[PDB]
Amino acid sequence: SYTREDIIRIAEEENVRFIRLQFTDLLGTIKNVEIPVSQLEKALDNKMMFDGSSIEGYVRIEESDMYLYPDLDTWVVFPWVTSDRVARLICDIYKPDGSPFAGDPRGILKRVLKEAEELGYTSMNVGPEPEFFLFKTDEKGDPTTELNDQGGYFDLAPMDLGENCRREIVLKLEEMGFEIEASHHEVAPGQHEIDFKYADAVKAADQIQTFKLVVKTIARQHGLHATFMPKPLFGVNGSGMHCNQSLFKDNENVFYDETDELGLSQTARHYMAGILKHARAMAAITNPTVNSYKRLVPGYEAPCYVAWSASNRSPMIRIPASRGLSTRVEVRNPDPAANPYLALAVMLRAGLDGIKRQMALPAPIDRNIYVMSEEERIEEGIPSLPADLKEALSELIRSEVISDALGDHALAYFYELKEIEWDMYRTQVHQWERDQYLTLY
Amino acid sequence: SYTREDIIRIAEEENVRFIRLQFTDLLGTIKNVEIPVSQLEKALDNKMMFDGSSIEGYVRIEESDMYLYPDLDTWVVFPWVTSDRVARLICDIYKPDGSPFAGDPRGILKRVLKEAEELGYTSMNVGPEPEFFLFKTDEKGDPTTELNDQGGYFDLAPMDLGENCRREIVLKLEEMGFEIEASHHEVAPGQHEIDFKYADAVKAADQIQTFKLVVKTIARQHGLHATFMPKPLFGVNGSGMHCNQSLFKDNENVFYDETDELGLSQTARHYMAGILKHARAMAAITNPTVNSYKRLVPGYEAPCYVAWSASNRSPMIRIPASRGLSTRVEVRNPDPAANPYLALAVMLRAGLDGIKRQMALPAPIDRNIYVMSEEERIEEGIPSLPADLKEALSELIRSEVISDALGDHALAYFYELKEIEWDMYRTQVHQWERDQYLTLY
């Protein structure tokens, strides 16, 4: 933990000259306001005013005025091995009247956590599994189509010290105070995964944001380009952001049950049932980009159907073999492009709705995999994830549970942003069309 | 030897920040899970869980959960002359129920060593002779067709300090704790061989893996590419991995016999007979790649026929002139692309089968060499190694002795991997076909 006096003492001792007042917009892009150390005391008094409409993205229509309220527990100093140290603070957005801004994703996640606490659950334990690609750059600094390496699953391809980004990223994160569980090479060439140790949902989302920033910074430093785009290349594995989740009640894992055959309590089963029922509604949030649904194709371990299993090629929900206090429900739809706060909020809200309504868990899918026909698929009651962004947007609009989690203000702006994105995408004429046509016709 | 306290003490003293939990898959590729030093204690408690299906290669079907059990005796710190030291631990794979994984090559070798111990042999002493090629790289870092030098057999070509990879490799290996016997320039230009001192079979295979990793790392450090491909170039010598073997019973070499004319005991002769009988069955393991059988062609010192001799151009089995406690049986089929654990396991199993069945050793081949006709060859009972991967796969499937050494789980996945590889290879249209045809026809 930290206090105002502690922050001032550390900043004076560490010779910090630059402070980043970091926050997040609806699209998940990392936003911040620069600050000289001479304004640190003014920042700590919650008196910095900025636009605030930058949260709405490229659909902002008027300039507003909002205040930044830093979270002292998020203070950290970047270890960029240079003089004039740079520090950061993660801030909540507040209206000038003192009320919190309704469109802040962090506030949305906090409100969902509060309504979870109202049910008796003290915390949401979340551990994400972000994967990213590393691309080579040209003389002008733009990414090329060449990967940094040609390693495979759990390979030791980036060895030694030459352009070993994965080692440097883990080392710098550990120096910052990150709790890193493990990291490995991913299935596709040039793909890497770093797994964090588990923490509370707000801390987990802050860690995801900081991890993305640190990965991009370190990759750029080595003459490489890091991307979290869900499907950068056709025919290769995409990047996922599997989120392991478990509800806690005073350091007691309520998802655990020794008497259960699978070690899953009734509360856990209701949670998974609620997540499964609302899957197509949250698909627009956990898979927010157009490219997100190019990853949701069969044959690349990404989930394409709403079903749960303990062992399958690509289930919606996977139950890891770990038990006891580490029993978890792993949701595999989200991609790293998703907003962490919004994705965690909608997943938690769906789980809470399932718990409150005492939803019935459908039977798991056996070793039988999805070569079955569509008639066999809907005869067994196996739904499918939306095929593109438009279907997910329609499902989100028609949904009343997760739209309430988003809130009235944020839902309209997110829908406007995604509608504009889809409208821009759908009218484009791609090179594939010119290759197929223009000679046959 | 080492203990948990010793490992923790060394890691704290050496400022180790990165630990590689290294293991091996069925194809022999080096696999590992990265770990920050803050998780060293958790790693030493055998509590790290990973996929485990990565052992199966590209034929893995579903995600599993398996634990890593580090072997404390394999601890070593890489001497990469840089801060933030990197260490490694070689781990065995265990199922969540506590039983060892049946598909782990190290476990397979351990089981074969255990069934050898059940016959009264305390250890298998193995000294390998890995050979590799050094290639130049371009501006983009990809290997070219130009060799690092144009030296010959036992030449002093890579002298001085300029791109002297062989000297640096030996120096770094000695600094790590490797027992290097000698090294020399190999027959082909750009080919190098490093011979280790003899050790136990598991330690020998671990040393082979570490040697390949170190060679690749140091070669890349000097702007060169190191490959262990059995036959990278047509018309030049290939790379072999001759394995000298001898059974021991309480520091007594049971292969030795002073009264024998050749200094070979009856147990040694039974061992060689058993290896010779099952040669075509183990060919799929000791020569696992398609390119492995482009090396097994006459005129390049590689063995092409199943026969043993003390002095010949290229025998299946060679008996070195060394006697006493250094009497050895040298098997020359394996190439460096082979999995060390699996190759040692199958060779030991064939030798044990020969010992148990008291097999009769065929007569050695004299100075007469293989210009004889096929009728003369099968009149004298001289078998030939498989001509390609498919024949070796069929022989492996029909074999009951070495398939039991592989085990039921590993055999199916190895067969699937090799069948997929052969199917991909056999349908390709190569440049040689377009050169011969496309103008004549």
């Binding site: 495979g152 025919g235 069969p298 | 590209y58």
Partner: peptide
């Protein structure tokens, strides 16, 4: 079903 792992051959 296994397409993303066989990318080595493509």
């Amino acid at each position: 079903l296994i397409q993303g792992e066989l990318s080595r051959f493509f």
